[PDB]
Amino acid sequence: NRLKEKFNTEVTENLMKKFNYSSVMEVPKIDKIVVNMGVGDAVQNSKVLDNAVEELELITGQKPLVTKAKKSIATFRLREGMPIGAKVTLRGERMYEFLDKLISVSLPRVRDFQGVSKKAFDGRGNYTLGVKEQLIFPEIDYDKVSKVRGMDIVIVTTANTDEEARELLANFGMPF
Amino acid sequence: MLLPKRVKYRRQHRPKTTGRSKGGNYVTFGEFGLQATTTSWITSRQIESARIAMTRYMKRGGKVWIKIFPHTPYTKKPLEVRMGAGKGAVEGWIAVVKPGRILFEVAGVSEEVAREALRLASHKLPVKTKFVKREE
Amino acid sequence: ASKKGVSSTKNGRDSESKRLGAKRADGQFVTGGSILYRQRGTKIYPGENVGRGGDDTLFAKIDGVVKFERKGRDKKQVSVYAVA
Amino acid sequence: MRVNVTLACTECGDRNYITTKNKRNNPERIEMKKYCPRLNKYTLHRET
RNA sequence: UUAUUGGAGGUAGAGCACUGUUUGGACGAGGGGCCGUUACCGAAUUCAGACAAACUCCGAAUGCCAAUUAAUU
RNA sequence: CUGGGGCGGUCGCCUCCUAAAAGGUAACGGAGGCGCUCAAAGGUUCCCUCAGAAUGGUUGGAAAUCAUUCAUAGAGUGUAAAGGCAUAAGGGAGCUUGACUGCGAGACCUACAAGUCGAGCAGGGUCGAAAGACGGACUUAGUGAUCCGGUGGUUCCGCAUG
RNA sequence: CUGGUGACUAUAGCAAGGAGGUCACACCUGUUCCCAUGCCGAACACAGAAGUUAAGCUCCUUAGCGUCGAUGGUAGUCGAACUUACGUUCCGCUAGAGUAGAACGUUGCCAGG
RNA sequence: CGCGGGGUGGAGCAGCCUGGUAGCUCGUCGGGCUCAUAACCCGAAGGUCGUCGGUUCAAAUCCGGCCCCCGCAACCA
RNA sequence: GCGGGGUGGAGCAGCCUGGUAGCUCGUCGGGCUCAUAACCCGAAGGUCGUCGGUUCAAAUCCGGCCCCCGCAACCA
RNA sequence: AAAAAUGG
Numbered sequence: 011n012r013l014k015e016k017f018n019t020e021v022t023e024n025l026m027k028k029f030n031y032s033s034v035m036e037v038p039k040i041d042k043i044v045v046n047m048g049v050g051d052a053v054q055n056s057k058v059l060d061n062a063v064e065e066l067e068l069i070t071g072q073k074p075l076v077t078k079a080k081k082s083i084a085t086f087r088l089r090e091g092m093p094i095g096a097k098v099t100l101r102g103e104r105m106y107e108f109l110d111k112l113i114s115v116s117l118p119r120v121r122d123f124q125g126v127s128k129k130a131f132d133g134r135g136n137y138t139l140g141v142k143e144q145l146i147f148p149e150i151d152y153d154k155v156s157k158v159r160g161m162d163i164v165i166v167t168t169a170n171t172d173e174e175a176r177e178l179l180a181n182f183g184m185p186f
Numbered sequence: 187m188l189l190p191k192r193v194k195y196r197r198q199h200r201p202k203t204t205g206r207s208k209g210g211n212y213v214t215f216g217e218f219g220l221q222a223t224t225t226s227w228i229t230s231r232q233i234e235s236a237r238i239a240m241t242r243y244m245k246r247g248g249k250v251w252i253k254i255f256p257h258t259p260y261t262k263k264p265l266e267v268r269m270g271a272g273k274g275a276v277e278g279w280i281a282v283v284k285p286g287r288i289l290f291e292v293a294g295v296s297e298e299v300a301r302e303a304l305r306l307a308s309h310k311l312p313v314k315t316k317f318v319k320r321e322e
Numbered sequence: 323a324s325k326k327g328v329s330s331t332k333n334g335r336d337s338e339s340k341r342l343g344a345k346r347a348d349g350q351f352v353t354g355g356s357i358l359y360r361q362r363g364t365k366i367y368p369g370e371n372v373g374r375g376g377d378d379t380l381f382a383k384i385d386g387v388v389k390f391e392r393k394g395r396d397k398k399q400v401s402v403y404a405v406a
Numbered sequence: 407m408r409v410n411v412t413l414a415c416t417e418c419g420d421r422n423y424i425t426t427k428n429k430r431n432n433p434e435r436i437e438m439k440k441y442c443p444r445l446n447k448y449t450l451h452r453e454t
Numbered sequence: 455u456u457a458u459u460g461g462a463g464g465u466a467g468a469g470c471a472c473u474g475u476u477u478g479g480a481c482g483a484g485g486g487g488c489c490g491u492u493a494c495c496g497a498a499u500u501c502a503g504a505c506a507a508a509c510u511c512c513g514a515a516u517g518c519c520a521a522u523u524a525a526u527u
Numbered sequence: 528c529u530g531g532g533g534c535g536g537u538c539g540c541c542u543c544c545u546a547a548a549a550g551g552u553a554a555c556g557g558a559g560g561c562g563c564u565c566a567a568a569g570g571u572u573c574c575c576u577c578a579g580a581a582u583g584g585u586u587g588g589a590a591a592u593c594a595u596u597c598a599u600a601g602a603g604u605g606u607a608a609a610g611g612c613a614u615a616a617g618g619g620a621g622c623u624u625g626a627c628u629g630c631g632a633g634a635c636c637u638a639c640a641a642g643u644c645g646a647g648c649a650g651g652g653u654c655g656a657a658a659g660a661c662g663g664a665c666u667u668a669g670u671g672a673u674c675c676g677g678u679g680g681u682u683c684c685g686c687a688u689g
Numbered sequence: 690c691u692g693g694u695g696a697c698u699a700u701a702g703c704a705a706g707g708a709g710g711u712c713a714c715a716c717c718u719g720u721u722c723c724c725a726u727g728c729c730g731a732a733c734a735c736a737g738a739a740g741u742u743a744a745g746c747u748c749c750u751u752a753g754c755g756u757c758g759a760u761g762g763u764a765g766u767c768g769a770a771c772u773u774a775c776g777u778u779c780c781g782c783u784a785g786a787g788u789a790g791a792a793c794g795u796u797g798c799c800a801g802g
Numbered sequence: 803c804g805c806g807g808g809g810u811g812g813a814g815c816a817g818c819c820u821g822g823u824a825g826c827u828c829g830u831c832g833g834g835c836u837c838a839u840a841a842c843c844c845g846a847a848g849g850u851c852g853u854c855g856g857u858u859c860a861a862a863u864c865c866g867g868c869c870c871c872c873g874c875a876a877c878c879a
Numbered sequence: 880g881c882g883g884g885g886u887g888g889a890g891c892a893g894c895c896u897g898g899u900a901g902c903u904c905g906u907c908g909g910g911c912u913c914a915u916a917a918c919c920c921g922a923a924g925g926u927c928g929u930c931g932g933u934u935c936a937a938a939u940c941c942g943g944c945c946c947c948c949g950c951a952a953c954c955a
Numbered sequence: 956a957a958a959a960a961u962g963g
């Protein structure tokens with residue numbers, strides 16, 4: 011819980027001083043992290059979705075929820091109820107461990123890494139990071155990766171504004 | 187030629203024609219208007235004839251508003267057929283006009299030009315009319 | 323004499339009318355089991371001592387006086403109350 | 407459902423109920439607990 | 455039959471809140487010919503004005519069902 | 528049947544409008560459905576709430592999956608329409624078979640034959656901690672008299688008697 | 690006054706601004722235990738009391754939205770008289786829209802203060 | 803309703819009688835052939851035998867259930 | 880009045896049974912010829928008559944507008 | 956002893 015200790019000690023004080031919070035309960039915190047992988051080619055080959063689920067489970071540490079089509083779309087040849095994604099929600103210690111790992115061990119493994127988008131905030135204090143290749147994560151061996159596919163990592167925060175969310179993530183150590 | 191782009195029902199009961207004008211009894215867009223004083227169906231062809239007459243007299247100087255619209259289809263049987271065997275096919279489109287409704291409005295011209303234009307228009311219509319101004 | 327060919331209508335169908343609606347009046351005494359109201363859905367709801375049949379028919383469960391009552395802002399119900 | 411089905415008590419053999427089933431969805435002889443009036447108890451009935 | 459009281463219900467009228475129909479403005483989320491700015495602005499929004507047997511946010515007069523109900527019959 | 532007959536169309540059942548605010552109400556008037564489906568899409572207990580839009584995000588585009596916000600019903604309700612249903616009748620899960628047996632005060636509808644609703648009682652059950660709910664399905668179509676014959680059951684009869 | 694739990698067609702709602710905390714209600718700290726997540730102690734469940742009124746919640750102000758809403762007049766209409774006129778007249782009933790205005794709830798029971 | 807028969811590579815026929823082995827004629831691919839073209843000759847790929855079961859060391863073959871097609875015959879709610 | 884049909888340039892399938900546009904000829908390119916034809920190899924070419932509807936999805940299912948074909952149009 | 960047209 012090194013990252014959590016940093017948040018309790020340094021980030022809390024820095025952020026509260028910067029934004030003039032009358033109470034500590036106003037200090038933003040990372041509510042959850044949702045790691046999603048949309049596998050639309052599972053329509054054509056379910057083994058792709060199975061491999062994606064296994065890789066996501068290795069990355070995150072817990073079994074993913076398989077997400078199914080909410081509606082049928084002819085162009086995609088998608089029928090309602092067909093499994094076309096995987097999702098993991100991380101909270102608490104696992105969330106913090108994954109976050110520090112992503113900041114330190116994983117993100118620098120990005121090829122030609124030059125920081126993460128600073129404008130990728132929903133407008134209400136939540137940040138979505140699109141990783142373009144799973145090989146980034148240290149838990150995956152490229153030998154067993156039949157196909158390389160990305161992920162969406164949604165950091166959901168209690169910050170009301172992109173400015174506060176940016177300050178929180180920067181203090182945590184996100185490049186920008 | 188006005189007519190709805192589509193309707194839910196092409197075969198409709200013909201509208202009630204007794205009573206007074208429910209609405210649109212005041213000049214609201216232009217300065218002058220043509221007010222119906224009797225009741226009639228008004229066809230799209232009659233609307234078009236009156237519109238052309240008044241606009242041609244105004245010589246594009248002013249602006250014209252058609253306040254009525256022929257929403258209602260009416261049917262007619264094929265020639266020389268007996269009664270029964272279903273309702274006939276849509277023949278045309280009509281607006282129901284009762285006393286007091288403003289049929290047309292004009293603006294951007296003198297009162298004299300508006301009077302003459304609306305006179306020419308009224309002679310194309312199956313109702314008696316009167317020249318009206320905005321009230322205040 | 324000249325006679326023209328006629329077409330046909332594709333219409334000309336209707337189901338039997340179902341005699342829906344109120345079957346007893348507000349303020350009327352009814353015996354238990356009397357149908358109060360025939361309906362589709364709950365246009366009126368069962369109130370006190372009133373049941374709702376499988377086809378939504380409203381009926382009295384006790385002997386008593388029928389009372390149609392407001393139910394909230396938009397709805398209504400029918401109840402039966404025992405007479406003294 | 408698209409075919410008629412007779413449910414007979416598997417203890418006394420009485421044909422106590424009729425029902426229906428879809429033959430493609432349930433090709434097998436369907437079974438279920440039903441009340442057997444002769445035995446005055448619930449017994450397993452199955453399609454004849 | 456009338457008087458009084460209660461109730462069911464959606465017509466006439468009216469209205470546009472829904473489903474459709476429809477006339478003038480204003481403005482344009484955004485892209486194209488255009489350099490930023492003189493089509494389409496098809497969207498959406500918005501102001502005002504209209505139409506309806508199978509529209510209704512509303513809603514009569516009557517008629518109808520009743521009442522330990524009174525008067526006349 | 529038929530705005531003469533033939534020809535064409537139609538014939539039973541369900542929903543809406545015509546229908547004149549109870550109910551009913553015709554025409555070869557205006558519109559559509561039905562001759563099924565479901566072993567769960569039934570019962571019960573617990574839990575849940577949509578469609579759509581905006582903004583971020585990789586393969587991913589106007590729409591796939593993820594996140595926040597707004598969004599009161601514009602979604603869904605097997606299947607037409609109407610009436611209902613967001614205290615759900617809509618959605619998920621667990622357990623189940625009441626899609627029971629004998630019935631039935633009373634009531635609707637109605638020329639008859641039929642058709643519809645039904646508390647409650649008894650037997651034996653399912654779910655539920657319990658109250659309680661359950662005699663199919665959000666409701667209303669999905670059906671056809673008698674005679675005759677087939678099949679199963681039967682403390683019924685059995686042409687002198689068995 | 691606070692809370693719990695009811696009744697009433699939102700006159701009760703929404704929105705905006707402001708105030709509140711040892712009681713209490715929350716957020717909140719955790720996952721050993723009963724219980725739980727199609728993944729997640731988020732939720733449900735349980736154990737607990739370091740911190741906070743930030744949010745919920747409660748209270749206060751208002752009339753922007755929503756809700757309610759006359760009187761008067763008009764449409765429609767039962768009946769009658771006259772009438773065929775896309776009618777007239779008389780009587781009774783009497784909208785919808787709109788206007789003035791009402792309104793930021795009113796109350797029962799119980800336990801605390 | 804009874805009795806027979808049929809279902810086999812992309813098409814049309816054997817092999818079922820009597821248990822093993824999937825043959826024949828067209829069709830496609832490659833080669834020889836020729837000035838090409840056809841014809842002809844030689845190499846290959848092509849159905850696991852309508853479907854599900856059953857008896858056997860062994861099933862296209864034997865025995866059942868089921869799905870279609872054909873011939874004749876039967877049919878007084 | 881009732882039926883049937885409308886799909887590359889032509890003729891004809893595909894519809895019945897929604898997810899898949901086929902054949903012959905014609906056209907274009909390369910080849911063979913002294914050249915043309917024939918022939919061989921390779922390619923392009925139809926928003927399925929036109930508007931609406933149901934559907935996640937329409938040549939296909941449903942309803943109009945148009946065009947063509949066939950049959951019918953009888954008794955005085 | 957298969958078939959192989961034409962050329963101002």
Ligand SMILES: [K+]
Nearest residue numbers: 308309311313
């Ligand atoms: K005139």
Ligand SMILES: [Mg+2]
Nearest residue numbers: 202466467468
């Ligand atoms: Mg009206």
Ligand SMILES: [Mg+2]
Nearest residue numbers: 268269530531
């Ligand atoms: Mg005649």
Ligand SMILES: [Mg+2]
Nearest residue numbers: 546549550551
């Ligand atoms: Mg009625």
Ligand SMILES: [Mg+2]
Nearest residue numbers: 673674675879
């Ligand atoms: Mg007979």
Ligand SMILES: [Mg+2]
Nearest residue numbers: 685687688689
């Ligand atoms: Mg004997």
Ligand SMILES: [Mg+2]
Nearest residue numbers: 912914915916
């Ligand atoms: Mg040549």
Ligand SMILES: [Mg+2]
Nearest residue numbers: 914961962963
């Ligand atoms: Mg020569």
